[PDB]
């Protein structure tokens, strides 16, 4: 069975571990502790093919940590998880498109900016200089929502096919 892995990171209210866990027991997680390390994998099939997937959410344990670098080259699926209805999910995104650089130093991952929270009316972030910042990398602009299994499909889904071109 293939096996690939993806790298999730974003920001502490995006909605990235809700998207992970829901994936997988589906009950939308509504006070999940960020001070918790630990890889949640998967086992169902993208189009007649199965295909494992270590999913990494990366939290933090205090300090000095070293494992969120060491995960940067060795996962390949960047799923930068943005909530639009935050803004400060945004400008990490801006920053965290030069670590995941620094570890490859090569500037072609195979990156996807996702939408998170797209679930409402309520839309800081218009849908337009979102499109700007993701086709400059030349990556594709998504939209999921952990709070009702929305989106979650076209992000997970981007990634595994990405990677299988590469
Ligand atoms: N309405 C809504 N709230 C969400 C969604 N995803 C996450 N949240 C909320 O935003 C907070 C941050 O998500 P959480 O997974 O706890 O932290 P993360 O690690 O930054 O994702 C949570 O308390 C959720 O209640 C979503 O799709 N819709
Ligand atoms: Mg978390």
Redesign the pocket.
């Known amino acids: 069975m293939t096996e690939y892995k993806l790298v999730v990171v974003?920001?502490?209210?995006?909605?990235?571990?809700?998207?992970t866990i829901q994936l997988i027991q589906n009950h939308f997680?509504?006070?999940?502790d960020?001070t918790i390390e630990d890889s949640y994998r998967k086992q169902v099939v993208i189009d007649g093919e199965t295909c494992l997937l270590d999913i990494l959410?990366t939290?933090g344990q205090e300090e000095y940590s070293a494992m969120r670098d060491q995960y940067m080259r060795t996962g390949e699926g960047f799923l930068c998880?943005f909530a639009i209805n935050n803004t400060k999910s945004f400008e990490d995104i801006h920053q965290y498109r030069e670590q995941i650089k620094r570890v490859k130093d090569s500037d072609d991952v195979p990156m996807v900016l996702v939408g998170?929270?797209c679930?409402?009316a309520a839309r800081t972030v218009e849908s337009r200089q979102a499109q700007d910042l993701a086709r400059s990398y030349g990556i594709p602009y998504i939209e999921?929502?952990?709070?009702?299994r929305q989106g979650v499909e076209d992000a997970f889904y981007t990634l595994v096919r990405e990677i299988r071109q590469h």
């Open positions: 974003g920001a502490g209210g995006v909605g990235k571990s809700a998207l997680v509504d006070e999940y960020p959410d939290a998880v998170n929270k679930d409402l999921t929502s952990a709070k009702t």
